Structure formats: structure tokens, C-alpha cells
């Protein structure tokens, strides 16, 4: 009484769903091709080289595996009888390539998340020895490692079995009456997948906390002191008598000194001797000198030059210390966009792979007894279907994240919260 009825089945009878496979493969192909057109041509970081590698790996997965399932389902035959020149080799190759692509894609996503976390958190280590060579030599290394790793059943540590209705093939997990060389590969594969997913989630969380720290540091010093300066200039320009002028000027002077103590998000690695900080400090010094001469002229002696001095101060403020503020804000928004793209990709990958791990651990050593006929094959097919359908959704995320009007509305949406 073998667990799988359809292990030796040589024919297929089902509900003509080959056209559905055709339309899904067509949608995936057009999504991949439009995504590879859009940014890689019009738009043109180390993030985007990794994204490009991910898209091309996914495209080569779709162009290779969906044709075989569609052809077997269309010729009205099982996967052992679809091609007469090779009966078992088709099943072995199908399962081998499915597992290999599934592992390599997850390794690439983990590398993406780890690189972004390191870049956002620790800038000195990131700048020291991470460049476009690293972002260009990720996919060959991880793909070679996964292709070397997924060859154990061809060596003697696992088994590939055809799943009912005979149109799919995958590693066997529900074991014999009892064995030691069939538990090993299944649990090792699922353990690796779980560890990769956990590491990816942790890296995402760390990067988010570092970006929050950056936002708070920007929002305190420069931005609140700028608001104070604007309010003090307004209250000077709308005032009568020379009593409150001294108090407003002193509040403005204190705010200017505190703001001069601040640090922009960029050109912060080298605080001294940087021209981008030196002219910042020079502009604040000029503003403080103007405040000092206004105080001397209109406060030690009574005269109404304070309004003209305030107008001159506003004119020299609105000239060449707005560029730093605007550059800082723009940098923060582009960082937030990169993190959102990572978050969506991570959510998809973590969701659509846990059924496989759960099924592998459920069929192994957690079985006093299992109802076997109508309750395990229909459950086994779903995990394979989800692991396959990861491929369709991947490039459409990038298309929507770089759409003409859709991404514009999206960016207008998520900035507010």
C-alpha cells in the first residue's frame, strides 16, 4: 500500500486547464518583459543591480518550467509518457530545477535585505568595501551554490517522486514504512528555507529602525530650529516699540547657534574641513553678525532700523541655506521608497513558501498515522502550486513601483502617514 497512487500512472484525464496555464504564462511573460524594458531602459545604486539579477533569474525560470507542464497537460499524457525519448529523466529534471530555482531566488532576496540594512545602518563599513562589483557578483555565486546543493538525491540522500495526477514532480517527504535516507534531505531542505526566511525578516526590521532614527535626528535640530527662526522673523517684522525687539532677536540668536550645531544627513562622515559644512557654518555666521549689528543699531539706541534689518535677514536666509534642507528631505524620501520595495518583496516570499516546509515536517516523524488517500495529495499539490506562482507576482511589483500614474499616486499616498 504505497502512499502515492499516481507514482506509475501513464495517462492524464482532467478538465482542459492547459489554456489557463497558457494565459498565466503569457501574463508573466508580458509583466517580466515590460518590467525589464521600463526601468532598465528609461530609468537607466547597488540595490537596482540586484533587482535586475532577480528579474532575469525569474524570467529564465518561467521560460523553462511552465512549457513542460503545459505540454504534458496538452498532449493528454503523464509526465513519464509526454516525451518517449526520456521517461524518468523528465521527472527528475523537473523536480531538480524547481528546487534549485526556489532556493537560489531566496538567497538573492536575503542578500538584498542584508545589503540594504548594512548600508542604512553603518555607513563606514558599507562605504569601505561594498561597490558595484559586489552587486554584480551575487547571482553567479548563489546560483552555483544552490545548483551544487540541490544534487543530493542524484547522489544518494533523497528521492524525487511524481505527484498525482502525474503532471508534477517533487521531492518525496511522507517516507517509507521507515527510513534514514529519506528524512535527511527533506528536513535539511526545509530547515535551510526557514533559516533564510528568518534572517531576511530580521534584517528588514533592523533597517526600518535605523531609518526611523535618521528621520528623528533630521526632524529635531535643523527643522525645529528653522521653524523657530521663521516665527521669530515674523514676530520681528510684525511688531511695535523697541521693547520686544531685543527679546525676539535674542531668541533668534539662540536658535541660530543651536541650528549651526546641527548636522545634515549627507556629508556627515567628515564633519570638519568639508566645504559642504564650512559654507553652512559661514552662512550661519553671517546671519549672526547681521543679528548683532541690528541689535547694536536698534536696541542700544532707539531707532526703527529693525524692520529693514529683518527684511535683509530674511532675504539672506532665503537665498543659500534652503538647498541643504531640500536635499535632506529628498534623500529621506528616496530611502523610504527603497525600503518599501524590500518590504513588499519580503512579504510575498515569506507568505508563499511556508506550506512546503510545514508539509515536509508534517510528513516526517510527526505521523502516528495519517489519512492517506483523499486528504494528502490534494494538500500536496497546493504547496507546489504556490511555490511555482511566486514567479508571476515578482516583476509586477517593480512595474507598479515605477508606473507613470500608479506610482505617482502611491508616492502621494504613503508620504502622509
Amino acid at each position: 500500500s504505497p502512499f502515492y497512487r499516481c507514482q506509475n500512472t501513464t495517462s492524464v484525464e482532467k478538465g482542459n486547464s492547459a489554456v489557463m496555464g497558457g494565459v498565466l504564462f503569457s501574463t508573466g511573460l508580458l509583466g517580466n518583459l515590460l518590467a525589464l524594458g521600463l526601468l532598465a531602459r528609461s530609468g537607466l545604486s547597488v540595490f537596482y543591480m540586484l533587482v535586475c539579477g532577480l528579474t532575469v533569474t525569474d524570467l529564465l525560470g518561467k521560460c523553462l518550467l511552465s512549457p513542460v507542464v503545459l505540454a504534458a497537460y496538452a498532449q493528454n499524457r503523464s509526465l513519464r509518457v509526454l516525451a518517449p525519448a526520456l521517461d524518468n529523466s523528465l521527472c527528475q529534471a523537473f523536480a531538480f530545477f524547481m528546487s534549485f530555482f526556489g532556493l537560489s531566488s531566496t538567497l538573492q532576496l536575503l542578500a538584498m535585505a542584508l545589503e540594504r540594512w548594512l548600508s542604512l545602518g553603518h555607513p563606514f563599513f558599507y562605504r569601505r568595501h561594498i561597490t558595484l562589483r559586489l552587486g554584480a557578483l551575487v547571482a553567479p555565486v548563489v546560483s552555483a551554490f544552490s545548483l551544487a546543493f540541490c544534487a543530493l538525491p542524484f547522489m544518494g540522500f533523497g528521492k524525487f517522486v511524481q505527484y498525482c495526477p502525474g503532471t508534477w514532480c517533487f521531492i518525496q517527504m511522507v517516507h517509507e514504512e521507515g527510513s534514514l535516507s529519506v528524512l535527511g534531505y527533506s528536513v535539511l531542505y526545509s530547515s535551510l528555507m526557514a533559516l533564510l526566511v528568518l534572517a531576511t525578516v530580521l534584517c528588514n526590521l533592523g533597517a526600518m529602525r535605523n531609518l526611523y532614527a535618521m528621520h528623528r535626528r533630521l526632524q529635531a535640530d535643523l527643522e525645529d530650529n528653522w521653524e523657530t527662526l521663521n516665527d521669530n522673523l515674523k514676530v520681528i517684522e510684525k511688531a511695535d516699540n523697541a521693547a520686544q525687539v531685543k527679546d525676539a532677536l535674542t531668541k533668534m540668536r539662540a536658535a541660530a547657534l543651536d541650528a549651526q550645531k546641527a548636522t545634515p544627513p549627507k556629508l556627515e562622515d567628515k564633519s570638519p574641513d568639508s566645504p559642504e559644512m564650512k559654507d553652512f557654518r559661514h552662512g550661519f555666521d553671517i546671519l549672526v553678525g547681521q543679528i548683532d549689528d541690528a541689535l547694536k543699531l536698534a536696541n542700544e539706541g532707539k531707532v526703527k532700523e529693525a524692520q529693514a534689518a529683518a527684511e535683509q535677514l530674511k532675504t539672506t536666509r532665503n537665498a543659500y541655506i534652503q538647498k541643504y534642507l531640500e536635499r535632506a528631505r529628498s534623500t529621506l524620501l528616496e530611502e523610504l521608497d527603497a525600503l518599501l520595495l524590500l518590504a513588499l518583496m519580503t512579504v510575498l516570499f515569506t507568505m508563499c513558501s511556508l506550506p512546503v516546509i510545514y508539509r515536509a515536517y508534517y510528513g516526517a516523524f510527526k505521523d502516528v498515522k495519517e489519512k492517506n488517500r483523499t486528504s494528502e495529495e490534494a494538500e500536496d499539490l497546493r504547496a507546489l502550486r504556490f511555490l511555482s506562482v511566486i514567479s508571476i507576482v515578482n516583476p509586477w511589483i517593480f512595474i507598479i513601483f515605477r508606473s507613470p500614474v500608479f506610482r505617482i499616486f502611491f508616492h502621494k499616498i504613503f508620504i502622509r502617514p
Partner: antibody
Amino acid sequence: EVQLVESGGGLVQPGGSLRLSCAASGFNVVDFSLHWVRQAPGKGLEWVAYISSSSGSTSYADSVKGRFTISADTSKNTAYLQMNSLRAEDTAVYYCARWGYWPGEPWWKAFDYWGQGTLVTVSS
Amino acid sequence: DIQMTQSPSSLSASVGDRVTITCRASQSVSSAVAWYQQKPGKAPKLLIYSASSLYSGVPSRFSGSRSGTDFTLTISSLQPEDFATYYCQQYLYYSLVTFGQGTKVEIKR
């Protein structure tokens, strides 16, 4: 080689007059602002008046203003404080101190040098 | 008229103690706060000049810190020559100078 030495303090009747001279040494009075400070017997410190000769700027404390005046002679390198309506509350020890100009570190260090002080007592 | 409040007024300690004095400002003066030491029959001396900076010639056991318009002067291990009176000053403009009230330290028996 920087010093600040005062003179001209002594016993005067209430309502009298007295001129206190602060004679800077080792630096030019034109390039530094200078201030007057006083301390009552068994009490704390208190600021009195301010002159900057380069800008011609002059300020006084609330009680001092209207009664005392301050002048500077650059050739003589001396600052004067003329005291015209002296009362019993003026009995104290007086100090003249310096302060530098913005920008730079000279402004950030407030009172790096004082004088030894002179005692003014008002009693009939 | 920015005011300064100094605590405590009288302190009794022994040689080798750790001493902390606190000054508080009414408004924000950024970091423009100084500390002075005076002995009977003498002119005041400067120790700290930017709420964290040591003047030349002052021994390193004197420390100063700033947090939220609260300023702290610390002596890590008191020495017999540190029995004097201490003042805190704010300086913002040439006409804006204010002193504290003082704190005297003496010997415990």
C-alpha cells in the same frame, strides 16, 4: 603680560563724586570690549556697565543708568567710569574685565581676565 | 532678564568624596554658560567656558555637562584646595550677563 589695574576708590560722602580708571596692559583697548563688575561685602557678583570703543557702543545696568558714565581714551589706553550720585548701596569692591568680539573663539570665552578690584565706601 | 538658580547652598564633604553642583537657566542660552571659583579676598577665576570646555591651566578633575538647560559641575575626587565658593554665569549678548548665587563647600567631622 596682560593685566588690569584700577585706581581711584576711597571714602566719599553720600551724594559725592568719584572717577574710577581702568588701565589695560598688554593689549589694545580698541580691539576689546570692556565691562565693570562689583561685589558687595559678604554677597555675590553683579554686572554694572559696558563700553566698546570701536563701534562707539555703551550700555548700563538698570540702577546705574542715568547716574554713571563711561568713556574711553585710546591714546591713553584707559577707560573711565564717572560716578556722580553715590549712595550707601555703592559700598563694594569694583572690577574691570574684558570681552572679545564675534566671530571666533574670542567671543565664546566670556571673562578670562579680571582686575584686582578697588574698594569704594560711602559713609558720612 | 535670564536668571540662574544654583543648588545646593552649603555642602559638607571629606577629601576623596564626589561632589556635584547643579545650575539651571530660565531660557535656552544654547551652550553659553561659564563656571567660576572664588576664595575669600580674591578675584574670581574661570574654569568652564562653554558648559563643557576646560579653560587652560585648570586641573582635569573639574567636569561640566549640559542637558536640556540643566548644567552640572562635578569634582570626581575632592582635594583640600577645592574648599571655596563656586558661581555659574550665563552670557548671551554684551548687555546680557547674569551670575548665580554661590555654593560653599566645607569639611565633615
